[PDB]
């Protein structure tokens, strides 16, 4: 029953850290923009 066992719900600050992990997913979006950079190649077949 004591809080030491951990049964208490995780602090709201903790779940906010999980949102930080989502921010790393945003950086993955930046990698997608690099995919757009590939377009620079000439239209000619390669």
PDB file of N, CA and C in Angstrom:
ATOM      1  N   UNK A   1       0.854  -1.222   0.000  1.00  0.00           N
ATOM      2  CA  UNK A   1       0.000   0.000   0.000  1.00  0.00           C
ATOM      3  C   UNK A   1       0.875   1.252   0.000  1.00  0.00           C
ATOM      4  N   UNK A   2       1.989   1.204   0.727  1.00  0.00           N
ATOM      5  CA  UNK A   2       2.880   2.355   0.819  1.00  0.00           C
ATOM      6  C   UNK A   2       3.329   2.809  -0.567  1.00  0.00           C
ATOM      7  N   UNK A   3       3.512   4.116  -0.720  1.00  0.00           N
ATOM      8  CA  UNK A   3       3.941   4.681  -1.998  1.00  0.00           C
ATOM      9  C   UNK A   3       5.266   4.085  -2.484  1.00  0.00           C
ATOM     10  N   UNK A   4       6.087   3.580  -1.565  1.00  0.00           N
ATOM     11  CA  UNK A   4       7.386   3.021  -1.936  1.00  0.00           C
ATOM     12  C   UNK A   4       7.249   1.887  -2.957  1.00  0.00           C
ATOM     13  N   UNK A   5       6.108   1.198  -2.952  1.00  0.00           N
ATOM     14  CA  UNK A   5       5.904   0.069  -3.860  1.00  0.00           C
ATOM     15  C   UNK A   5       5.757   0.511  -5.320  1.00  0.00           C
ATOM     16  N   UNK A   6       5.341   1.756  -5.546  1.00  0.00           N
ATOM     17  CA  UNK A   6       5.240   2.284  -6.907  1.00  0.00           C
ATOM     18  C   UNK A   6       3.817   2.230  -7.479  1.00  0.00           C
ATOM     19  N   UNK A   7       2.876   1.608  -6.768  1.00  0.00           N
ATOM     20  CA  UNK A   7       1.512   1.470  -7.276  1.00  0.00           C
ATOM     21  C   UNK A   7       0.883   2.825  -7.611  1.00  0.00           C
ATOM     22  N   UNK A   8       1.326   3.891  -6.944  1.00  0.00           N
ATOM     23  CA  UNK A   8       0.799   5.225  -7.217  1.00  0.00           C
ATOM     24  C   UNK A   8       0.996   5.572  -8.700  1.00  0.00           C
ATOM     25  N   UNK A   9       0.081   6.276  -9.337  1.00  0.00           N
ATOM     26  CA  UNK A   9       0.259   6.662 -10.772  1.00  0.00           C
ATOM     27  C   UNK A   9       1.546   7.452 -10.988  1.00  0.00           C
ATOM     28  N   UNK A  10       2.191   7.236 -12.132  1.00  0.00           N
ATOM     29  CA  UNK A  10       3.429   7.945 -12.442  1.00  0.00           C
ATOM     30  C   UNK A  10       3.204   9.460 -12.389  1.00  0.00           C
ATOM     31  N   UNK A  11       4.169  10.246 -11.953  1.00  0.00           N
ATOM     32  CA  UNK A  11       3.986  11.728 -11.879  1.00  0.00           C
ATOM     33  C   UNK A  11       3.637  12.320 -13.249  1.00  0.00           C
ATOM     34  N   UNK A  12       2.826  13.359 -13.316  1.00  0.00           N
ATOM     35  CA  UNK A  12       2.514  13.996 -14.631  1.00  0.00           C
ATOM     36  C   UNK A  12       3.783  14.469 -15.340  1.00  0.00           C
ATOM     37  N   UNK A  13       4.791  14.867 -14.564  1.00  0.00           N
ATOM     38  CA  UNK A  13       6.067  15.263 -15.151  1.00  0.00           C
ATOM     39  C   UNK A  13       6.695  14.118 -15.944  1.00  0.00           C
ATOM     40  N   UNK A  14       6.503  12.882 -15.477  1.00  0.00           N
ATOM     41  CA  UNK A  14       7.073  11.735 -16.175  1.00  0.00           C
ATOM     42  C   UNK A  14       6.480  11.592 -17.569  1.00  0.00           C
ATOM     43  N   UNK A  15       5.147  11.618 -17.654  1.00  0.00           N
ATOM     44  CA  UNK A  15       4.510  11.513 -18.966  1.00  0.00           C
ATOM     45  C   UNK A  15       4.936  12.661 -19.883  1.00  0.00           C
ATOM     46  N   UNK A  16       5.221  13.835 -19.309  1.00  0.00           N
ATOM     47  CA  UNK A  16       5.744  14.938 -20.111  1.00  0.00           C
ATOM     48  C   UNK A  16       7.071  14.555 -20.761  1.00  0.00           C
ATOM     49  N   UNK A  17       7.890  13.783 -20.043  1.00  0.00           N
ATOM     50  CA  UNK A  17       9.134  13.293 -20.628  1.00  0.00           C
ATOM     51  C   UNK A  17       8.858  12.431 -21.857  1.00  0.00           C
ATOM     52  N   UNK A  18       7.774  11.653 -21.809  1.00  0.00           N
ATOM     53  CA  UNK A  18       7.398  10.850 -22.970  1.00  0.00           C
ATOM     54  C   UNK A  18       7.102  11.736 -24.176  1.00  0.00           C
ATOM     55  N   UNK A  19       6.501  12.901 -23.929  1.00  0.00           N
ATOM     56  CA  UNK A  19       6.309  13.874 -25.002  1.00  0.00           C
ATOM     57  C   UNK A  19       7.646  14.327 -25.586  1.00  0.00           C
ATOM     58  N   UNK A  20       8.683  14.378 -24.750  1.00  0.00           N
ATOM     59  CA  UNK A  20      10.021  14.694 -25.244  1.00  0.00           C
ATOM     60  C   UNK A  20      10.484  13.646 -26.252  1.00  0.00           C
ATOM     61  N   UNK A  21      10.158  12.383 -25.982  1.00  0.00           N
ATOM     62  CA  UNK A  21      10.475  11.322 -26.931  1.00  0.00           C
ATOM     63  C   UNK A  21       9.775  11.571 -28.263  1.00  0.00           C
ATOM     64  N   UNK A  22       8.535  12.057 -28.203  1.00  0.00           N
ATOM     65  CA  UNK A  22       7.823  12.405 -29.428  1.00  0.00           C
ATOM     66  C   UNK A  22       8.577  13.482 -30.207  1.00  0.00           C
ATOM     67  N   UNK A  23       9.228  14.405 -29.494  1.00  0.00           N
ATOM     68  CA  UNK A  23      10.016  15.430 -30.173  1.00  0.00           C
ATOM     69  C   UNK A  23      11.127  14.804 -31.012  1.00  0.00           C
ATOM     70  N   UNK A  24      11.725  13.719 -30.511  1.00  0.00           N
ATOM     71  CA  UNK A  24      12.725  13.007 -31.306  1.00  0.00           C
ATOM     72  C   UNK A  24      12.117  12.481 -32.604  1.00  0.00           C
ATOM     73  N   UNK A  25      10.857  12.041 -32.546  1.00  0.00           N
ATOM     74  CA  UNK A  25      10.160  11.647 -33.772  1.00  0.00           C
ATOM     75  C   UNK A  25      10.063  12.822 -34.749  1.00  0.00           C
ATOM     76  N   UNK A  26       9.955  14.043 -34.223  1.00  0.00           N
ATOM     77  CA  UNK A  26       9.944  15.219 -35.084  1.00  0.00           C
ATOM     78  C   UNK A  26      11.243  15.315 -35.875  1.00  0.00           C
ATOM     79  N   UNK A  27      12.363  15.019 -35.214  1.00  0.00           N
ATOM     80  CA  UNK A  27      13.647  15.020 -35.911  1.00  0.00           C
ATOM     81  C   UNK A  27      13.637  14.009 -37.060  1.00  0.00           C
ATOM     82  N   UNK A  28      12.945  12.883 -36.870  1.00  0.00           N
ATOM     83  CA  UNK A  28      12.774  11.932 -37.970  1.00  0.00           C
ATOM     84  C   UNK A  28      12.047  12.579 -39.148  1.00  0.00           C
ATOM     85  N   UNK A  29      11.125  13.496 -38.848  1.00  0.00           N
ATOM     86  CA  UNK A  29      10.456  14.253 -39.902  1.00  0.00           C
ATOM     87  C   UNK A  29      11.463  15.073 -40.704  1.00  0.00           C
ATOM     88  N   UNK A  30      12.467  15.616 -40.016  1.00  0.00           N
ATOM     89  CA  UNK A  30      13.521  16.354 -40.703  1.00  0.00           C
ATOM     90  C   UNK A  30      14.250  15.454 -41.698  1.00  0.00           C
ATOM     91  N   UNK A  31      14.458  14.194 -41.318  1.00  0.00           N
ATOM     92  CA  UNK A  31      15.058  13.234 -42.240  1.00  0.00           C
ATOM     93  C   UNK A  31      14.204  13.078 -43.497  1.00  0.00           C
ATOM     94  N   UNK A  32      12.882  13.116 -43.332  1.00  0.00           N
ATOM     95  CA  UNK A  32      11.992  13.052 -44.486  1.00  0.00           C
ATOM     96  C   UNK A  32      12.241  14.230 -45.423  1.00  0.00           C
ATOM     97  N   UNK A  33      12.492  15.405 -44.845  1.00  0.00           N
ATOM     98  CA  UNK A  33      12.806  16.572 -45.662  1.00  0.00           C
ATOM     99  C   UNK A  33      14.056  16.327 -46.504  1.00  0.00           C
ATOM    100  N   UNK A  34      15.020  15.586 -45.953  1.00  0.00           N
ATOM    101  CA  UNK A  34      16.183  15.181 -46.746  1.00  0.00           C
ATOM    102  C   UNK A  34      15.765  14.352 -47.963  1.00  0.00           C
ATOM    103  N   UNK A  35      14.683  13.587 -47.816  1.00  0.00           N
ATOM    104  CA  UNK A  35      14.139  12.843 -48.948  1.00  0.00           C
ATOM    105  C   UNK A  35      13.713  13.797 -50.061  1.00  0.00           C
ATOM    106  N   UNK A  36      13.136  14.930 -49.670  1.00  0.00           N
ATOM    107  CA  UNK A  36      12.815  15.982 -50.630  1.00  0.00           C
ATOM    108  C   UNK A  36      14.070  16.533 -51.307  1.00  0.00           C
ATOM    109  N   UNK A  37      15.171  16.596 -50.558  1.00  0.00           N
ATOM    110  CA  UNK A  37      16.435  17.084 -51.106  1.00  0.00           C
ATOM    111  C   UNK A  37      16.925  16.238 -52.281  1.00  0.00           C
ATOM    112  N   UNK A  38      16.626  14.942 -52.254  1.00  0.00           N
ATOM    113  CA  UNK A  38      16.999  14.059 -53.359  1.00  0.00           C
ATOM    114  C   UNK A  38      16.426  14.522 -54.704  1.00  0.00           C
ATOM    115  N   UNK A  39      15.323  15.265 -54.674  1.00  0.00           N
ATOM    116  CA  UNK A  39      14.698  15.754 -55.904  1.00  0.00           C
ATOM    117  C   UNK A  39      15.659  16.590 -56.757  1.00  0.00           C
ATOM    118  N   UNK A  40      16.675  17.180 -56.134  1.00  0.00           N
ATOM    119  CA  UNK A  40      17.583  18.080 -56.839  1.00  0.00           C
ATOM    120  C   UNK A  40      18.220  17.431 -58.069  1.00  0.00           C
ATOM    121  N   UNK A  41      18.324  16.102 -58.083  1.00  0.00           N
ATOM    122  CA  UNK A  41      18.939  15.408 -59.211  1.00  0.00           C
ATOM    123  C   UNK A  41      18.233  15.768 -60.516  1.00  0.00           C
ATOM    124  N   UNK A  42      19.004  15.865 -61.595  1.00  0.00           N
ATOM    125  CA  UNK A  42      18.445  16.234 -62.891  1.00  0.00           C
ATOM    126  C   UNK A  42      17.329  15.264 -63.292  1.00  0.00           C
ATOM    127  N   UNK A  43      16.290  15.713 -63.970  1.00  0.00           N
ATOM    128  CA  UNK A  43      15.188  14.796 -64.407  1.00  0.00           C
ATOM    129  C   UNK A  43      15.688  13.648 -65.286  1.00  0.00           C
ATOM    130  N   UNK A  44      16.821  13.854 -65.955  1.00  0.00           N
ATOM    131  CA  UNK A  44      17.366  12.843 -66.852  1.00  0.00           C
ATOM    132  C   UNK A  44      17.593  11.520 -66.126  1.00  0.00           C
ATOM    133  N   UNK A  45      17.380  10.419 -66.839  1.00  0.00           N
ATOM    134  CA  UNK A  45      17.590   9.094 -66.267  1.00  0.00           C
ATOM    135  C   UNK A  45      19.020   8.952 -65.755  1.00  0.00           C
ATOM    136  N   UNK A  46      19.184   8.202 -64.669  1.00  0.00           N
ATOM    137  CA  UNK A  46      20.505   7.992 -64.086  1.00  0.00           C
ATOM    138  C   UNK A  46      20.694   6.529 -63.700  1.00  0.00           C
TER     139      UNK A  46
END
